[PDB]
Every structure is written in C-alpha cells, then in structure tokens.
Amino acid sequence: GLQHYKIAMDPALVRLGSMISNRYKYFRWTKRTALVSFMYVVVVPSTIGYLAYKTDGLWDLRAKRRGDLISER
Amino acid sequence: PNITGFDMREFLRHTKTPTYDPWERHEAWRYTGRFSRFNRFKGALPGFGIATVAFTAYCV
Amino acid sequence: MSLLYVLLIIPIIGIFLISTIDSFYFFNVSYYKKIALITTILNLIVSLIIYILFDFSNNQFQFIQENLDLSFYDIYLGVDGVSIYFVLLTTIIMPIALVSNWNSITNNIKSYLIIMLLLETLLLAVFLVLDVLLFYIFFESILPPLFILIGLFGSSNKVRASFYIFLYTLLGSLFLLLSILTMSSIVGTTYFDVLLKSSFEYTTQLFLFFGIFIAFAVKTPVWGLNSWLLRAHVESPLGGSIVLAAIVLKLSLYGVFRLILPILPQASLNLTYIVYAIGAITVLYASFSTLRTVDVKELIAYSSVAHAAIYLMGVFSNTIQGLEGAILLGLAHGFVSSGLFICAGGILYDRTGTRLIYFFRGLTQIMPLFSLFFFILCLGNAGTPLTLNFVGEFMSLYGTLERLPIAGMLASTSIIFSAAYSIYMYNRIAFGGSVSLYFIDCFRDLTKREFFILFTLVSFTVILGIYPSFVLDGLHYNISSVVYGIEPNASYLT
Amino acid sequence: RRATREEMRDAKVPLAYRDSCAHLLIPLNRCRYETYYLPWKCEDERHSYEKCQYLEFKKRVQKMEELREAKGGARSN
Amino acid sequence: SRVHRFLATGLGASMWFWIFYRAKKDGPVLLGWKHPW
Amino acid sequence: QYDPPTGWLWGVRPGEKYQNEGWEGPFFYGFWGSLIVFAIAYAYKPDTSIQTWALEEARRRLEAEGILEDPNPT
Amino acid sequence: PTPESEAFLAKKPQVPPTFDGVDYEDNKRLKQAQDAIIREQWVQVMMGRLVREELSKCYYREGVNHLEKCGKLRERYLQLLANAKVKGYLFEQQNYWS
Amino acid sequence: PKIPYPKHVWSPAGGWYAQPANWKQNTAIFGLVIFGITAMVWKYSAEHEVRHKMPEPDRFYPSRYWVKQIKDYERAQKEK
C-alpha cells in the first residue's frame, strides 16, 4: 500500500527468496528422500511415543521417603 | 627431499643473535640502558629492598 | 439484558455505524477508524466491568440470561473462571490490532474494519456460549471473514494462504462435527450443564477423542499439519495476523477445557502418550526449522507452533499446575506474539517492503526504541523470567514432566531451543554489524503509534509476569473441576 | 568434665564437632563472637582447644597399630 | 607524576614486609617444628 | 568534551511538532484510561479466591491440634 | 478458635462432600456436592501451606538444631504432602466404591 | 577523536556523547527521587523484617534504631 523506503534490492537475494518460496513445487519421491521422510515422520515419533507408552505411570516422586521407591510399576 | 633448500635443523641452528645483520641500527634500541638485562630486573620486586632494611630494624 | 450479550452486540453497532454514516452525512476514511477504534474500547470497558463483578470461586456459570424460549438452536452465554481470561484477551487485543494497521490499510477501509468488528463478535461468542454445538457454530463462523480478509488485504501469496486456512480448518472441523453430533445423539443435547454430567462408554470416548483431537491438532497447529499457519499468518495483514496468532490459535486450547477433559476423561488419560509424542516431536521440529527460516514473519509465526505444543502438553497433564500454566502460556503467548508480528510485519515490513532477514542488520544504530522493545519481546519469546511467558512455560512443563517424565524432558529442551532462535533473530536484525548496506535510505525510529502498541504489549507480559496472581486467582477454583483422579485416603469420605 | 548435650545443643555448636572435646569448643566460640573472630585475640585458649584436638587425634591413630597388624598391613580405607 | 612510583613501592614494600613478619611468627608452625600449643 | 543530547522523538524535526493521527484520544483516554480506572477499582473488589476461604478453615483445623495456638481457649 | 467471618458463611458448603444419595437430576444438589468435594480438597492442601509456614519459621529459628527440634512439623507436612492434592470431583461423580 | 553519528536519532540512554547543559540540575532531581523511594523501601523493610534472635544490648547493631520487630522488644524488656 503506502510507499516504503528505498532499498538496494539485491537480485541474487531476491531470487534466493523466490526459490525458497517456490521450492515446494519441485519436490520428488526419490530414494534418499523417502528415507528422510520416513525417518523423521514415522520412526522418530514412533520411538518417542513408544518410550512414553512404556514409562507411563512408572515413576512418582511426590513424597517418597527413604524406604519407598520412585518406581510404582 | 625438499627441492627447496630449507632444512629445519639448519633453521634451528640459525636461531641466535646474528653476528652481522642489515638491521642492528634500528633494532639495537631494544637492548639498551632502559632495557638492559640489569635495569629491566632492577625493580622486578619493587618494595623488596626497603622492606628488608625495615624488617631487620624491627628484629633488632 | 446480560452483559454477555452487550459484548456481542457492541461490535455490530460499529458495523452498522460504519456502513451508514455515508448516508447520514464523501466521508473521510479517518472517521471509520475512529468509530472502529472506539467500538473495541467500549467492548473492553464492559469486559473489565464483567471481570470486576466476576466471582473467582463459583461453580455455576455467571452473567447468564433467562430465555424460556426453547428453539432447536438457541444461543446461551455464560462465563466461568476458564473462559473469562480468554474473553479479556480478545477485548484487550482488538483495539491494538486496529491501531497496528491504522496507516497500512489504504483501500477497502470499511471492508477491513467491518470484518475485524465481525471477527470480534464471532471470536468472543466462542468463549461465551454454553453449548458444544454453539461452540462449533462460532469456531467455524470465522472462516468466511478470514478468507476475505486475507485475499482483500494480503501479500503476494494471499490466494494460496486464504485457500490453505479455510480448507484445513473446514476439514479438521468436519471431524470435530462428527464427534459433537455423536454426543448429541447419546445425551440428547450439548448444553454444558447437561452434557458435563454424562459419562460416555470408554470405547465411545476413544472414537470421540479422535476427530475432536484430529480437529484440534490441525488448529493447534501440531507439526506436519502446520503448513496453513506459515502461509496464512505471513500473508495476512498485520491486524488479521495479530488476531490469528493471539486469539484464533487459543480457541482449541480453550476447547480442550470444554470438549475433551470434562467428558472424555479415560480416553485423554490413555491416549496421552500419543499427544505427548506429537507435542514433543512438534517442539523439536518446530524449533529446528525456525532456526533456518529466512522470512522474519515466517520465523515469528512458526515459533508459535513451538509454544502451542508446550501448552498443548500442559493441558493433557491432568495436573492443576500444568492446566493453569497452559492457560497462562496461551495468554502470555498472545501478548508476545502480537508484539513480534508488529515488530516484523509492521515495523520492518512497512519500512522496507521485504520480509527477508538477509536485508536487515544493525538496526540498533538507527532505531534505539525498536531494539529496546524488540529485545524484551524476544526475551518473552525465549521464556525469560519477569515475563508471563516464563510462568506459563514453567508451570505447564512441570505438569508435562510430572505426567510423563520423558515427554516433559524432551519438551523441556525448548528452554534451549526457543532461546536459540529468538536471540539468533535478534542479533541478526538489531545487532551483528553497523547498519545493513542494502538500506540506501536511512530509516526513522518507532513512531508514537508504534511505541504505544508495543509498550502496552510488553507491559501486560511483564506486570502479569511479576504478579501472575491476577490471572491465577480466578483460575484456581474452576480448573479444579477438570482434573481426573482421586487419592486413596481423600475420596469417598463418610 | 565432658559437656552433656543439654548445654551443648543450647550452645549451638556444629554437628561435626559434637564430641568429647567440645567442652573447650564452647568457650572458643565465645571469643570469636566477642572478639569478632580476629585471629590474634584468644590465641591462648584457642591453643588449648587445638591441643585437645591433637590428643584425641593421637588416640585415634594409635588404635590401628593393632588394627593394621590384625589385617596384616592391608588397605583399611 | 612521581606519586605513582611511591604507591608502587609502598604496596611492594608493604607486601614483602608482611611475608617476613608473617614468617617470623607463623613460620615455625607450618615447618613441623613447633605445634601452636 | 561531550555533546548535547539530540534526536527527533517520534521522527518530528525541531522545526515542526507531532501531528495527531486520530488514534491518540481513544487509545490514551479510552483504552489506557479505562485500564487505570479498572486498576484502582480492582483494589476494592472483594476477595473471592478459594485459598483465602480455605486458609480460614485450614487455620481452624490446625488450631484444633498442637499447631497454631488459637487466640481463644474456648 | 477464630470465628468464621461473613466470607466464610456465603461459600461454606451446606452439604457433606459426597456423591452418595444424590440425584444427578437435581442440578443444584449435584453442583453443591461438586462444590463440597472441591472445598475439602482445597482445605487439606492449604493445611499444607500453613504447616509449611511454621516449619519455615522453625528452621530459621533453630539453625543447627533444626533436625531435632522441628520434626513435629516435618511429619505433619509430610503427611499432608502425601495425602492432600486437588484432584477434582469428576472421578467420584462417575464411579462408586464400596 | 569523536565518532560521527546521526543527529536525528533519539535515544533514551542519551545517544553518542550526550551530556545535557542541565545535567547537574536533573541529576539532583533524580537523586531526590531515588532517595525518596529508597526511604519508602526502608520504611517498609523496617516494619516487615522478621527475626527470631534478639541482638545483645552491648553489641553494634544499627538495625536496632529503625526495625520495629526488635525496637518494641527493647522497650518491652525495659519493664521489670
């Protein structure tokens, strides 16, 4: 809308920003990429979720004296 | 070995004050009365001299 | 007449006044902005009066109005401890959002002002209705005004941004709608008082959880479902970008207090490891990417995804500290996030026309006041103490940790990673050189308008961070009703 | 005479020094209070308390002259 | 400004004079000759 | 030597003065003014928190024990 | 003991903190039962805060001999710490025991 | 020397070499403000500083001259 200050618009920097903005159109399912997508979308959440499942209710600190245990399961 | 005639041992062998150099007349100022081996350590322990006399007086 | 209906009808009077002055008197577009600004402040006045009559230890909904005119769909309004602070935050933010875009909106000023006033009535109805079908009616009613606001006043990629927000919200909501419909069939209504004393079967609770959680996961947003936010928060005008990140995101956090915790107790307890897996994955992934984001707006927008995960984990803590800190976090976040969008989308963008962090450097040399507020704002985004962000961060992390230690531990890496991107963005813009050499034209510092809306926002986040008892006091008794559990010697007393 | 706990809890001496010799610890801690802990004021009775420290220490080092040989000069620690 | 020289020497003189004085009295004790008592 | 302080606050040059845009009266007299007036009024709002109610009962419950010597011996 | 003020008359629960013998069709009764459950839990927890305050006063009063002169509160706080907790009314409202 | 700088930049910390012509007059005003509320902090502290031990009468203890929780104790002990 309203005019802004004069900026020394770098052609290289404005084409890097356009490439980064438009990058989603050129993605393909290649050999390495499916491994990256599988690793970070499936494996890592699955590992984090599984350890949460196996440690749920396991420990409690609330008022544990000497003679009790942190573990409850 | 070392097609360029640089040998580390002779580099190390030439690690001293040279008998003649093209540069003493500009470099000699560093090794002078102000910066002699004696005048530089003349006050390495500033107050040591006076305290020794004072300590002896207290002992006696 | 109830003060709660006064909240809803005042912004509609402003819509009527703005659209009608031209007939009453070539009216100057400055008058509509004064009408729109005065309308939002009158609304804040009623909210401040409601909060001063509010009772912090009452379980019955307050400021209700008798209807005795039962139709199929009726609008019932009420306010308790959990919903009042979300109401106050909408009323505090809306005047600032209008003043933030005072000079930037140059065309269609009636359209811009009428949509914002409509959005205030619609957003406030969400926290005020007393029915789960009413809740959905207003949660999804904001889609048309938000679609038109982005396409009319957005940036270059506005069409894609306006298509992304409507379609994701429409899709996630239709899954929430199918769950809300199943409940109405079982209970016969979704009025809060009737529906709250319903105890669904566990298997029903599981399929009710999903769909409701599918919806709220898209509107949280959680990582992997967050493409709409980066497109729509960045392309949206500064005023609409403020409302989207300060109020719109907080409808799903408040929706857990009405649709998940009091009526799906067992499912929430059993499926907590899924939520904490998504939340911890979201914290990590949303943090590493915002380290690499080169759009300053996209970087502030996507840090919200990282904080939204933290109070989403705190709302599943089943801990009075985590639940309260989650509300404090969502309340504090709507202050800091509003200010950061002003700093980036309002102050940098209006002066340079570009959002690329490449072109900015060393603005402290020219803009002392901007660096002052932008530094306190980055300290709040990093959860530094003496800020309400710290208190919400700290309390919802304790609840997350006490519920699932390992998930709370992984979530507790945001102390490192949120500071990692808040100071990295600060030291590249305010510091890190003398002044950017792409600025062939020296800048002016903060104007009085830029100074006041920022000063107000850092004031709320700091006073409430030194005395969080202002919010915590009215929040204690009502969140006590959303915990699920008993003690071996403090239950079934005779 | 040995200082019983009743006047020795009231004296507020540290736990690790709650032993037989602490009867001389109570007066030592009063000079420190009265003389602002200056290390030139009650050196006299400080030496007395430090002296009784030595004797009890000596009785605790001679007690292994039969214990060490009982283990044949092994590692008692 | 000769005042700087006097403070330098004074601090050095005060320091060293202290070590001899603190060695005349405390010196025998830490050498294993005389226990304090 | 030191220089006198300088600069244009709000970007207003020494020759000119700041010009009101239209948001100042509503923001200062309305939003900020209401928030101040709300603050003093909050100082008189009666206490309605669950703690100060529960501290009163808990005070009596501990009073009927060895703790918290009560003012009256009943 | 300290007399109850008008503040501790309006909000004083008029009904025992139970969900037994309550008709959930009576909205007022269910809410009163819910309220009474919450007030009892909050009192036990605030009993911890008060006891925690004399234990704090004892600790700085005694100093060295706090480990043998402030143990009466140490159990009293520890018992309250292990028992008092605001857990809500929702589990008892949906399950009955014994 | 002295670094050149813009004269159009307004800083709250002053700027580049900012010393006002009235520095002393305003330093006096601010010093009174600092003293004024420091005394208020002193007044509040003296009333709410809580102790569990009473200093000996013969001992240096300037707190005795303002703090109330032991000021009343001295006069209370002065009754026998």
Find out whether C162 and C101 touch, Cβ atoms under 8 Å.
Answer: no
Does H12 touch chain C if contact means CB atoms closer than 8 Å? yes
G79 min Cα distance to partner chain A (Å): 9
| Closest CA relative to residue C83, chosen from C314, C255, C210 | C255
d(CA E36, CA C476): 65
3-state SS of chain C is CCHHHHHHHHHHHHHHHHHHHHHHCCCCHHHHHHHHHHHHHHHHHHHHHHHHHCCCCCCCCECCCCCCCCCCCCCCECECHHHHHHHHHHHHHHHHHHHHCCCCCCCCHHHHHHHHHHHHHHHHHHHHECEHHHHHHHHCCCHHHHHHHHHHHCCCCHHHHHHHHHHHHHHHHHHHHHHHHHHHHHHCCCEHHHHHCCCCCHHHHHHHHHHHHHHHHHHCCCCCCCHHHHHHHHHCCHHHHHHHHHHHCHHHHHHHHHHCCCCCHHHHHHCHHHHHHHHHHHHHHHHHHHHHCCEHHHHHHHHHHHHHHHHHHHCCCCCHHHHHHHHHHHHHHHHHHHHHHHHHHHHHHHHHCCCEHHHCCCHHHCCHHHHHHHHHHHHHHCCCCCCHHHHHHHHHHHHHHHHCHHHHHHHCCHHHHHHHHHHHHHHHHCCCCCCCCCECCCCCCCCHHHHHHHHHHHHHHHHHHHCCHHHHHHHHHHHHHHCCCCCCCCCCCC
Task: Tell me the two tokens of residue C98.
Answer: 């209008």
| Closest CA relative to residue C393, chosen from C420, C411, C373 | C411
Technique used = cryo-EM
Find out whether F71 and G2 touch, Cβ atoms under 8 Å.
Answer: yes
| Angle of helix C109-128 versus helix C132-139 axis, rounded to 10 | 160
Give the list of residues 6+ apart from residue G50 with CB closer than 8 angstroms, or none: F55, F58, F59, F62, F67, F68
Contacts 24+ apart (CB under 8 A), A57-63: A59/C405, A62/G81, A62/G82, A63/G78, A63/G81, A63/G82
| Closest CA relative to residue F27, chosen from C48, C98, C32, C242 | C98
Find out whether A4 and C350 touch, Cβ atoms under 8 Å.
Answer: yes
d(CA E7, CA D66): 61
Find out whether C199 and C211 touch, Cβ atoms under 8 Å.
Answer: no
CB contact under 8 A, G78 and A62: no
CB contact under 8 A, B47 and E21: no
CB contact under 8 A, A7 and C280: no
C476 min Cα distance to partner chain H (Å): 28
Helix (H, G, I), strand (E, B) or coil at F63: helix
G17 contacts in chain C (CB < 8 Å): 493
DSSP conformation class of A39: I
| Closest CA relative to residue C134, chosen from C191, C199, C173 | C191
B10-22 in b/e form (b: 16+ CB < 10 A) is: eeeeeeeeeeeee
* Conformation bin of residue C62: beta by default, left when phi > 0, alpha when psi is -120 to 50: beta
CB contact under 8 A, C368 and H10: yes
User: Gaps in chain G (C–N > 2.5 Å) come after which residues?
Assistant: none
3-state SS of G36-81 is HHHHHHHHHHHHHHHHHHHHHHHHHHHHHHHCCCCHHHHHHHHHHH
**Chains E and H touch, contact meaning at least 3 pairs of CB atoms under 8 angstroms apart:** no
Cα angle D36, D38, D41 (rounded to 5 degrees) comes to 105
Does E6 touch chain B if contact means CB atoms closer than 8 Å? no
Q: What would you report as the CA-atom Rg of chain F, rounded to the nearest whole angstrom? A: 28
Find out whether C234 and C155 touch, Cβ atoms under 8 Å.
Answer: yes
Cα angle C322, C324, C329 (rounded to 5 degrees) comes to 90
CB contact under 8 A, H12 and C445: no
* Burial (CB count <10 Å: 0-12, 13-18, 19+), residue C212: buried
C106 contacts in chain A (CB < 8 Å): 1-2
Kindly compute the dihedral angle of the four CA atoms of residues H66, H70, H74, H75, in this order, to the nearest 10 degrees: 80
d(CA D44, CA D26): 15
C131 has which bridge partners? C191
d(CA C4, CA C76): 10
| Closest CA relative to residue C84, chosen from C481, C478, C484 | C478
Our measurement of the distance from residue F45's CA atom to the centroid of its chain's CA atoms, rounded to an integer in Å, reads 13
Helix (H) or strand (E) holding A32: helix A31-38
Q: Which residue of F has its CA nearest to H22?
A: F4
G61 min Cα distance to partner chain H (Å): 5
Find out whether C275 and C222 touch, Cβ atoms under 8 Å.
Answer: no
d(CA C97, CA B4): 74
Our measurement of the distance from residue C161's CA atom to the centroid of its chain's CA atoms, rounded to an integer in Å, reads 19
Q: Tell me, what amino acid is at C459? A: S
Residue in the structure block whose two tokens are 């283990």: D71
Find out whether C97 and C39 touch, Cβ atoms under 8 Å.
Answer: no
d(CA C406, CA A49): 10
Task: Tell me the two tokens of residue D52.
Answer: 């009784």
| Closest CA relative to residue C275, chosen from C295, C292, C252, C297 | C252
C191 has which bridge partners? C131
Domain that holds residue G76: 1-98
Kindly compute the dihedral angle of the four CA atoms of residues D13, D15, D20, D24, in this order, to the nearest 10 degrees: -20
CB contact under 8 A, G90 and C484: yes
E35 min Cα distance to partner chain D (Å): 9
Omega before C221 within 30 of 0, i.e. cis: yes
Residue in the structure block whose two tokens are 């990429």: A33
D46 min Cα distance to partner chain E (Å): 9
E21 min Cα distance to partner chain B (Å): 7
d(CA C185, CA C197): 15
| Closest CA relative to residue G45, chosen from G84, G78, G16 | G84
| Closest CA relative to residue C336, chosen from C464, C478, C484, C167 | C464
Kindly compute the dihedral angle of the four CA atoms of residues C219, C220, C223, C224, in this order, to the nearest 10 degrees: -20
DSSP conformation class of A42: I
B46 contacts in chain E (CB < 8 Å): 8-9, 11-13
d(CA C181, CA C329): 31
Find out whether C320 and C483 touch, Cβ atoms under 8 Å.
Answer: yes
CB pairs under 8 A between D and E: 10
Q: Tell me, what amino acid is at C465? A: G
d(CA H52, CA G61): 5
Task: Tell me the two tokens of residue C364.
Answer: 């402290």
Contacts 24+ apart (CB under 8 A), H64-73: H66/H42
Task: Tell me the two tokens of residue C385.
Answer: 């103490």
Taking CA atoms, H34 is separated from G86, H26, H30, H66, in Å, by: 45, 12, 6, 20
d(CA E14, CA B10): 50
d(CA C301, CA C294): 12
H6 contacts in chain C (CB < 8 Å): 366, 442
| Closest CA relative to residue F48, chosen from C93, C380, C303, C58 | C58
A71 has which bridge partners? A59
Against chain H, the chains showing at least 3 CB pairs within 8 Å are: C, F, G
d(CA H35, CA C481): 49
Find out whether H14 and F9 touch, Cβ atoms under 8 Å.
Answer: no
C356 has which bridge partners? C295
Task: Tell me the two tokens of residue F49.
Answer: 């928190």
Residue C13, CA atoms < 13 Å, CB-side half-sphere: 13
Number of domains in chain G: 1
Helix (H, G, I), strand (E, B) or coil at D10: coil
d(CA C114, CA C19): 8
d(CA G98, CA G87): 20
d(CA D47, CA D30): 14
Does C108 touch chain A if contact means CB atoms closer than 8 Å? no
Q: What would you report as the CA-atom Rg of chain D, rounded to the nearest whole angstrom? A: 16
Give the list of residues 6+ apart from residue C349 with CB closer than 8 angstroms, or none: C238, C297, C355
d(CA G9, CA G5): 7
Helices then strands, counting H and E runs in chain G, come out as 4, 0
Q: Give me the resolution in angstroms, 1 decimal.
A: 2.8
Give the list of residues 6+ apart from residue D55 with CB closer than 8 angstroms, or none: none
